[PDB]
Amino acid sequence: RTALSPGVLSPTRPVPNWIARPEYVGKPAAQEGSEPWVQTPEVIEKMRVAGRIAAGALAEAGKAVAPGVTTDELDRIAHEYLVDNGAYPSTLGYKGFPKSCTTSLNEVICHGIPDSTVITDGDIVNIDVTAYIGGVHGDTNATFPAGDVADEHRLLVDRTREATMRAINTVKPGRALSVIGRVIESYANRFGYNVVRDFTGHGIGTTFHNGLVVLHYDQPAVETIMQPGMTFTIEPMINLGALDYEIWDDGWTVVTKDRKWTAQFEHTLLVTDTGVEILTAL
């Protein structure tokens, strides 16, 4: 199974005029980066709605993952699920991104652009879907096996899922945010994997990437303490090979330089008064 190259992009998928766009649609940048880290009760409840719809779309697209399917098709399925539930796909027109979700196979670390790429037996396919509804976002991703995947890749996906859920389980008010990347990097290193450092989790609320950064490796210099009402993602990318990467011509698709495969999972989390709530649970 050879290194991937880009395929043919399908035309822009339409969204009914009635669904409100985020402010950044059409524009070269987004108005984000300085929003409150702790959300109002109103925004938290709206975030449950957005989280559930993103989880739905993710699950629908994941069910279509099979040898012979295109990444564009997965995008079509996510896009239609979002639009059907009155959500805007937050990636669509985000910094010029042309599609409604990211689809990242095998050596693609993240940000793959859905296209005519055909999935084949043994591939691993991350689908990352974000929903915008009620003025708020919900962001979730998972890596799905296609046909008969090699044990080394099954394990990488299962261990990345587990690293994610372990880190989610550390979330509680008064705990240092740095605990998340300590738990993930510890678990990854136990199996000789390497955690991607350049790409991180993020605060999310009325804006997509609100300025809060969540590191997935051990960086105890971060002083942030988790607070009730804080909303962010945990979304580690875990590599079999070295961390070095390249970005394609399209300006989005990130691939490992050594072409070894990588996996990712993501949820959007709320810090509660005593622990955590996974907003993108289905």
**Residues at the interface with Co ion (CB under 5 A):** 128, 139, 141, 233, 235, 266
Closer by beta carbon to ligand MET, 206 or else 233: 233
DSSP annotation of 9 reads: P
Q: How far is the CB of 212 from ligand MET (least distance, A)?
A: 12
Name residues contacting Na ion, limited to 191-220 (CB under 5 A).
none
Decide the pairing of beta strands 201-202 and 213-214. antiparallel
Residue 14, Cα to own-chain centre: how many angstroms?
Answer: 22
Tell me the per-residue interface mask from 210 to 249 with ligand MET, x by CB under 6 A, - otherwise: -----------------------x-x--------------
- Which span (101-109, 129-137, 178-186, 190-198) binds Na ion, by CB under 5 A? 101-109
Compose the 145-174 pattern: x for residues touching ligand MET by CB under 6 A, - for all others.
------------------------------
State how far the Cα of 71 lies from the Cα of 93, in Å rounded to an integer. Answer: 18
266 annotated to bind ligand: yes
The answer to whether the CB of 156 falls within 8 A of the CB of 263 is yes
Q: Which does 262 bind (CB under 5 to 8 A by kind): Na ion, ligand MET, Co ion, none?
A: Na ion
**Residues of span 78-97 touching ligand MET by CB under 6 A:** 91, 94, 97
Q: Chain-centre distance of CA 64, in angstroms?
A: 18
- Which CB atom, from 96 or from 147, has the smaller least distance to Co ion? 96
Quick one: which of 194, 262, 268, 280 contacts Na ion (CB under 5 A)? 262
What's phi and psi for 152, nearest 5 deg? Answer: -65, -25
The annotation status of 111 as a binding-site residue, yes or no, is yes
Handedness of CA 243, 262, 252, 22 (dihedral sign): negative
113: buried, middle or exposed (CB in 10 Å: 19+, 13-18, 0-12)? buried
Contact criterion met (CB below 8 Å) for 163 and 236: yes
Torsion of the alpha carbons at 24, 238, 153 and 251, rounded to the nearest 10: 40
Query: Using CA atoms in the order 13, 19, 23, 24, what is the torsion angle rounded to 10 degrees?
Result: -10
Binder among 32, 60, 123, 139 for ligand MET (CB under 6 A)? 139
How open is the CA angle 271-181-41, to the nearest 5 degrees? 15
Q: In the complex with ligand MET, which residue's Cβ is closer, 37 or 122?
A: 37
Query: How are the residues of the chain apportioned to helix, strand and coil, as percentages rounded to the nearest 5?
Result: 25, 25, 50
Nearer to Co ion, 160 or 233 (CB): 233
Residue 266 contacts ligand MET per CB under 6 A: yes
Size of the site for ligand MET (CB under 6 A): 11
Note the residues at the interface with Na ion (CB under 5 A).
104, 108, 262
Note the residues at the interface with ligand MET (CB under 6 A).
91, 94, 97, 102, 111, 128, 130, 139, 233, 235, 266
Binding site: which residues? 111, 128, 139, 202, 209, 235, 266
Binding site for a divalent metal cation: which residues? 128, 139, 202, 235, 266
